[PDB]
């Protein structure tokens, strides 16, 4: 399993953390990467993918997952072929693009036909209990789709 972040500050990099360990918890091979830091022209190379992206000024995405997003955005974007996802994200209510981000990843995955495992979560600022009902979930999810 590979459990991408994107972290402007480094709230959904602890989520997933927390969640790469429920899988090493309940599995093993779990890979994290960070969104600057991984060569997401293999992401179609993933049979089980998980993304935690939080939603930046104007309601951009993270920066480190501009590249990817603008490259899943891309008419270069490769079909996900064998690849399932869920995305949990990161966002504040008092804004107007409140979690785009998640929405932007949510779309564009399943647009190319990517299988979403789970429903996208928003978070809002109290963010916490999101994380975990949702690391709660995929668990679950995961040991059921795997
Ligand atoms: C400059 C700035 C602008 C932001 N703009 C938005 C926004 O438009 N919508 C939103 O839902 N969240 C926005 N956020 C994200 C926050 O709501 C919050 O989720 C943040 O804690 C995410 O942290 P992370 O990037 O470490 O996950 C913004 C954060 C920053 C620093």
Known sequence: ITIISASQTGNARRVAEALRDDLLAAKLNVK???AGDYKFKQIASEKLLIV???????????????????FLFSKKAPKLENTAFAVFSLGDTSYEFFCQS?????????????????????????????????????????????
């Open 32 to 34: 994290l990467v960070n």
């Open 52 to 70: 935690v992206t939080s939603t930046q000024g104007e309601g951009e995405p993270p920066e480190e997952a501009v590249a990817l997003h603008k």
């Open 102 to 146: 998640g929405k932007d990843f949510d779309s564009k995955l399943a647009e190319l036909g990517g299988e979403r495992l789970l429903d996208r979560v928003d978070a809002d600022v109290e963010y916490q209990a999101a994380a975990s009902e949702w690391r709660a979930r995929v668990v679950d999810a995961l040991k059921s789709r795997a």
